[PDB]
Design an enzyme around this catalytic site. Structure first.
Site, PDB file in Angstrom:
ATOM      1  N   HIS A  83       0.788  -1.226   0.000  1.00 31.31           N
ATOM      2  CA  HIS A  83       0.000   0.000   0.000  1.00 31.31           C
ATOM      3  C   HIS A  83       0.837   1.302   0.000  1.00 31.31           C
ATOM      4  CE1 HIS A  83      -4.248  -0.012  -0.538  1.00 31.31           C
ATOM      5  NE2 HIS A  83      -4.037  -1.329  -0.554  1.00 31.31           N
TER       6      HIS A  83
ATOM      7  N   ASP B 142      -8.010   3.399   8.804  1.00 29.76           N
ATOM      8  CA  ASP B 142      -9.316   3.478   8.126  1.00 29.76           C
ATOM      9  C   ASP B 142      -9.489   2.258   7.219  1.00 29.76           C
ATOM     10  OD1 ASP B 142      -9.641   6.178   9.069  1.00 29.76           O
ATOM     11  OD2 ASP B 142      -8.729   7.027   7.245  1.00 29.76           O
TER      12      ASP B 142
ATOM     13  N   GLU C 285     -13.165  11.805  13.326  1.00 33.65           N
ATOM     14  CA  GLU C 285     -12.524  12.138  12.057  1.00 33.65           C
ATOM     15  C   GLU C 285     -13.278  13.329  11.425  1.00 33.65           C
ATOM     16  OE1 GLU C 285     -10.207   8.041  10.639  1.00 33.65           O
ATOM     17  OE2 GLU C 285     -11.225   9.331   9.173  1.00 33.65           O
TER      18      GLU C 285
HETATM   19  C1  LIG Z   1      -3.374   2.025   0.353  1.00 33.37           C
HETATM   20  C2  LIG Z   1      -3.919   2.555   1.654  1.00 33.37           C
HETATM   21  C3  LIG Z   1      -3.033   2.926   2.662  1.00 33.37           C
HETATM   22  C4  LIG Z   1      -3.491   3.417   3.886  1.00 33.37           C
HETATM   23  C5  LIG Z   1      -4.873   3.496   4.124  1.00 33.37           C
HETATM   24  C6  LIG Z   1      -5.764   3.138   3.105  1.00 33.37           C
HETATM   25  C7  LIG Z   1      -5.308   2.689   1.870  1.00 33.37           C
HETATM   26  C8  LIG Z   1      -6.304   2.450   0.761  1.00 33.37           C
HETATM   27  N1  LIG Z   1      -5.387   3.941   5.336  1.00 33.37           N
HETATM   28  C9  LIG Z   1      -4.530   4.306   6.269  1.00 33.37           C
HETATM   29  C10 LIG Z   1      -5.049   4.841   7.500  1.00 33.37           C
HETATM   30  O1  LIG Z   1      -6.216   5.080   7.722  1.00 33.37           O
HETATM   31  N2  LIG Z   1      -4.085   5.139   8.446  1.00 33.37           N
HETATM   32  C11 LIG Z   1      -2.732   4.953   8.296  1.00 33.37           C
HETATM   33  O2  LIG Z   1      -2.000   5.140   9.267  1.00 33.37           O
HETATM   34  N3  LIG Z   1      -2.246   4.496   7.115  1.00 33.37           N
HETATM   35  C12 LIG Z   1      -3.100   4.227   6.136  1.00 33.37           C
HETATM   36  N4  LIG Z   1      -2.610   3.821   4.925  1.00 33.37           N
HETATM   37  C13 LIG Z   1      -1.147   3.833   4.733  1.00 33.37           C
HETATM   38  C14 LIG Z   1      -0.454   2.556   5.197  1.00 33.37           C
HETATM   39  O3  LIG Z   1      -0.334   2.565   6.621  1.00 33.37           O
HETATM   40  C15 LIG Z   1       0.946   2.433   4.590  1.00 33.37           C
HETATM   41  O4  LIG Z   1       0.829   2.205   3.187  1.00 33.37           O
HETATM   42  C16 LIG Z   1       1.886   1.394   5.204  1.00 33.37           C
HETATM   43  O5  LIG Z   1       3.089   1.316   4.443  1.00 33.37           O
HETATM   44  C17 LIG Z   1       1.276   0.022   5.422  1.00 33.37           C
HETATM   45  O6  LIG Z   1       0.943  -0.575   4.154  1.00 33.37           O
HETATM   46  P1  LIG Z   1       1.495  -2.095   3.881  1.00 33.37           P
HETATM   47  O7  LIG Z   1       1.078  -3.095   4.878  1.00 33.37           O
HETATM   48  O8  LIG Z   1       1.041  -2.472   2.507  1.00 33.37           O
HETATM   49  O9  LIG Z   1       3.088  -2.037   3.851  1.00 33.37           O
HETATM   50  P2  LIG Z   1       4.070  -1.792   2.614  1.00 33.37           P
HETATM   51  O10 LIG Z   1       3.517  -0.704   1.780  1.00 33.37           O
HETATM   52  O11 LIG Z   1       4.223  -3.078   1.778  1.00 33.37           O
HETATM   53  O12 LIG Z   1       5.460  -1.421   3.291  1.00 33.37           O
HETATM   54  C18 LIG Z   1       5.621  -0.118   3.917  1.00 33.37           C
HETATM   55  C19 LIG Z   1       7.030   0.038   4.441  1.00 33.37           C
HETATM   56  O13 LIG Z   1       7.224  -0.836   5.580  1.00 33.37           O
HETATM   57  C20 LIG Z   1       8.161  -1.849   5.265  1.00 33.37           C
HETATM   58  N5  LIG Z   1       7.674  -3.106   5.829  1.00 33.37           N
HETATM   59  C21 LIG Z   1       6.619  -3.873   5.407  1.00 33.37           C
HETATM   60  N6  LIG Z   1       6.358  -4.893   6.189  1.00 33.37           N
HETATM   61  C22 LIG Z   1       7.321  -4.801   7.182  1.00 33.37           C
HETATM   62  C23 LIG Z   1       7.610  -5.605   8.305  1.00 33.37           C
HETATM   63  N7  LIG Z   1       6.925  -6.706   8.630  1.00 33.37           N
HETATM   64  N8  LIG Z   1       8.649  -5.236   9.090  1.00 33.37           N
HETATM   65  C24 LIG Z   1       9.350  -4.145   8.765  1.00 33.37           C
HETATM   66  N9  LIG Z   1       9.166  -3.306   7.741  1.00 33.37           N
HETATM   67  C25 LIG Z   1       8.134  -3.700   6.977  1.00 33.37           C
HETATM   68  C26 LIG Z   1       8.328  -1.830   3.739  1.00 33.37           C
HETATM   69  O14 LIG Z   1       9.589  -2.340   3.318  1.00 33.37           O
HETATM   70  C27 LIG Z   1       8.130  -0.335   3.452  1.00 33.37           C
HETATM   71  O15 LIG Z   1       9.306   0.420   3.697  1.00 33.37           O
HETATM   72  C1  LIG Z   2     -10.433   5.517  -2.120  1.00 29.21           C
HETATM   73  O1  LIG Z   2     -10.020   4.976  -0.899  1.00 29.21           O
HETATM   74  C2  LIG Z   2     -10.536   5.555   0.281  1.00 29.21           C
HETATM   75  C3  LIG Z   2     -11.887   5.876   0.446  1.00 29.21           C
HETATM   76  C4  LIG Z   2     -12.353   6.381   1.666  1.00 29.21           C
HETATM   77  C5  LIG Z   2     -11.473   6.549   2.744  1.00 29.21           C
HETATM   78  C6  LIG Z   2     -11.979   7.175   4.054  1.00 29.21           C
HETATM   79  N1  LIG Z   2     -13.371   7.567   4.163  1.00 29.21           N
HETATM   80  O2  LIG Z   2     -11.318   7.213   5.042  1.00 29.21           O
HETATM   81  C7  LIG Z   2     -10.153   6.096   2.623  1.00 29.21           C
HETATM   82  N2  LIG Z   2      -9.255   6.399   3.718  1.00 29.21           N
HETATM   83  C8  LIG Z   2      -7.831   6.325   3.649  1.00 29.21           C
HETATM   84  O3  LIG Z   2      -7.252   5.917   2.688  1.00 29.21           O
HETATM   85  N3  LIG Z   2      -7.182   6.871   4.807  1.00 29.21           N
HETATM   86  C9  LIG Z   2      -5.750   7.002   4.924  1.00 29.21           C
HETATM   87  C10 LIG Z   2      -4.861   6.777   3.884  1.00 29.21           C
HETATM   88  C11 LIG Z   2      -3.498   7.023   4.085  1.00 29.21           C
HETATM   89 CL1  LIG Z   2      -2.335   6.619   2.819  1.00 29.21          CL
HETATM   90  C12 LIG Z   2      -3.039   7.622   5.249  1.00 29.21           C
HETATM   91  C13 LIG Z   2      -3.970   7.922   6.214  1.00 29.21           C
HETATM   92 CL2  LIG Z   2      -3.495   8.663   7.727  1.00 29.21          CL
HETATM   93  C14 LIG Z   2      -5.328   7.717   6.030  1.00 29.21           C
HETATM   94  C15 LIG Z   2      -9.680   5.661   1.383  1.00 29.21           C
END
Ligand SMILES: *Cc1cc2c(cc1C)nc1c(=O)[nH]c(=O)nc-1n2C[C@H](O)[C@H](O)[C@H](O)COP(=O)(O)OP(=O)(O)OC[C@H]1O[C@@H](n2cnc3c(N)ncnc32)[C@H](O)[C@@H]1O
Ligand SMILES: COc1ccc(C(N)=O)c(NC(=O)Nc2cc(Cl)cc(Cl)c2)c1
Length: 454
Positions: A61, A125, A236
């Protein structure tokens, strides 16, 4: 124990993320069975002549290639393995659960609910994120003002360092590693186990949304709600387009069989003290799981329209509450005054719920806001992505030009002077010292673009 894959579908998945821009390809994808397999692979990278890049991938992500390991190996942490049951501790005064670092929060929730009706207290979220991924950033949603981010709700970790050593760490055992890894951008090791704090889950949620045309009243109400004794369980907000701008306050009140009789009055009493526009209160009553899974439901509708697998030039800022008024003037009314659209989130949090020993970077103010620009580009339209990237740069230039001490969350920095400014002198020194100790060859999470091999 584990297996190296050169399947084109595996390489392709490891070469992309949700941002849809960064595309650095690894040589192979590693599928571990356990922590020792991860330790083995990182150990081999550490001992190798070239010192190839190793990065863990959660659910992919990342917005700007943070989980990509150019010409190295991507560890697919997603994973037949037996899961630990939640445990009660008389010493901690509550429950916890050990989870594999690659576990998705949606799967953690389903597991803990089915084993004692327990759940994590602090969320994102979106639940189709990995535990290790959010714990490497912070993990924030509407519960963070009260419980803190997910990095404030973890008791212990197992970490595979950049030297391929498996280390158990917590506040009382190897705390420099534990606090370094939490919000640490994957720089000091791969999380193979996390011990998540749990609470007895509510059964249902009273989900409320109310509208404001006055930004001063909106922020005053959000700030009062996060200081609350009767209170909401989630706070929020989001910016809404006219069809000039409106602000939506979004709150919840969690409840079960015991509190079902008082939920209507608790809500009415809390709403009565607010200054939202009369007649704009929208209410939904639904199970706890359904509320927590609300973004996955939005995802299914986007996938149906071919609007999910598009570029996501998402920008997240932590803005000091003292500068939020100026922020609305120049940004929501100024810069943004669109592409395929997407939300613009806004809500305040309490800094005292964030442990200052962690690697997480927050503004130097007690109350700060998340401002999340979650706008998506139009499908197969590169110019839409370019226009959104220009808007993001205008927002950063606005903060810089008026001296708003904002900090990026999921920082997209690339240059050393940008990273030094982001951390500040004290935090940078602590960060660099942790890197020298736990990942001296800069093998891990090199896609973050902080360090290069010595
Ligand atoms: C795409 C997205 C992201 C998102 C979100 C909603 C969506 C649609 N809502 C979020 C929210 O409400 N609040 C929030 O704090 N973050 C939110 N995000 C962002 C999300 O937290 C980040 O994208 C985060 O990186 C987690 O995503 P993911 O699980 O897919 O991890 P990654 O992208 O592959 O890697 C991110 C970094 O961390 C390192 N990594 C990955 N796994 C590990 C482990 N197990 N140990 C150590 N490091 C790790 C990766 O190498 C990279 O640097
Ligand atoms: C199109 O994807 C949507 C649709 C709705 C939401 C929402 N209502 O929070 C949603 N929310 C998020 O992606 N929140 C989120 C996403 C990131 Cl990357 C970081 C943080 Cl602090 C918050 C994503």
């Amino acid at each position: 124990g584990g297996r190296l894959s050169v399947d084109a579908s595996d390489i392709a998945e490891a070469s992309r993320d949700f941002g849809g821009v960064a595309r650095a390809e690894p040589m192979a994808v590693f599928h571990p069975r356990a922590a020792g397999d991860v330790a083995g692979l990182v150990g081999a990278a550490f001992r190798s002549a070239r010192g190839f890049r190793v990065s863990a991938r959660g659910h992919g992500h990342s917005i700007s290639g943070q989980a990509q390991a150019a010409g190295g190996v991507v560890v697919d942490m997603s994973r037949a393995v037996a899961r630990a049951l939640p445990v009660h501790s008389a010493a901690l005064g509550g429950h916890y659960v050990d989870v594999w670092g690659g576990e998705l929060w949606v799967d953690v929730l389903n597991w803990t609910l089915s084993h004692g009706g327990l759940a994590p207290r602090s969320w994102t979220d979106y639940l189709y994120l990995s535990v290790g991924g959010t714990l490497s950033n912070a993990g924030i949603s509407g519960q963070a003002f009260h419980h803190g981010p997910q990095i404030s709700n973890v008791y212990e970790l197992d970490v595979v360092t950049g030297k391929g050593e498996v280390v158990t760490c917590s506040e009382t055992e190897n705390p420099d590693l534990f606090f370094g890894v939490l919000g640490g951008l994957g720089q000091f090791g791969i999380i193979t186990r996390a011990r998540i704090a749990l609470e007895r889950a509510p059964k249902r949620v009273r989900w409320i949304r109310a509208l404001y045309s006055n930004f001063s009243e909106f922020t005053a109400d959000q700030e009062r709600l996060i200081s609350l004794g009767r209170r909401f369980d989630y706070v929020e907000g989001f910016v809404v387009a006219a069809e000039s701008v409106l602000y939506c306050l979004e709150v919840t009140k969690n409840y079960d069989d015991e509190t079902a009789g008082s939920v209507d009055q608790d809500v009415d009493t809390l709403l009565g003290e607010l200054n939202f526009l009369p007649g704009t209160v929208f209410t939904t009553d639904l199970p706890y799981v359904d509320f927590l899974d609300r973004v996955h439901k939005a995802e299914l509708k986007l996938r149906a329209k071919g609007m999910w697998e598009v570029p996501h030039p998402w920008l997240n800022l932590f803005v000091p509450a003292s500068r939020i008024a100026d922020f609305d003037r120049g940004v929501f009314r100024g810069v943004l005054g669109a592409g395929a659209g997407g939300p613009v989130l806004i809500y305040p949090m309490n800094k005292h719920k964030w442990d200052p020993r962690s690697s997480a970077v927050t503004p130097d103010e007690e109350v700060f806001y998340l401002v999340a620009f979650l706008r998506s580009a139009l499908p197969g339209a590169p110019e839409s992505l370019e226009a959104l990237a220009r808007q993001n740069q205008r927002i950063l230039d606005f903060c810089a030009g008026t001296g708003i001490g904002a900090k990026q969350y999921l920082p997209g920095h690339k240059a050393r002077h940008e990273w030094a400014e982001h951390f500040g002198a004290a935090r940078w020194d602590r960060f660099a010292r942790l890197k020298a100790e736990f990942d001296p060859r800069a093998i891990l999470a090199a896609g973050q673009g902080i360090f290069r091999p010595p």
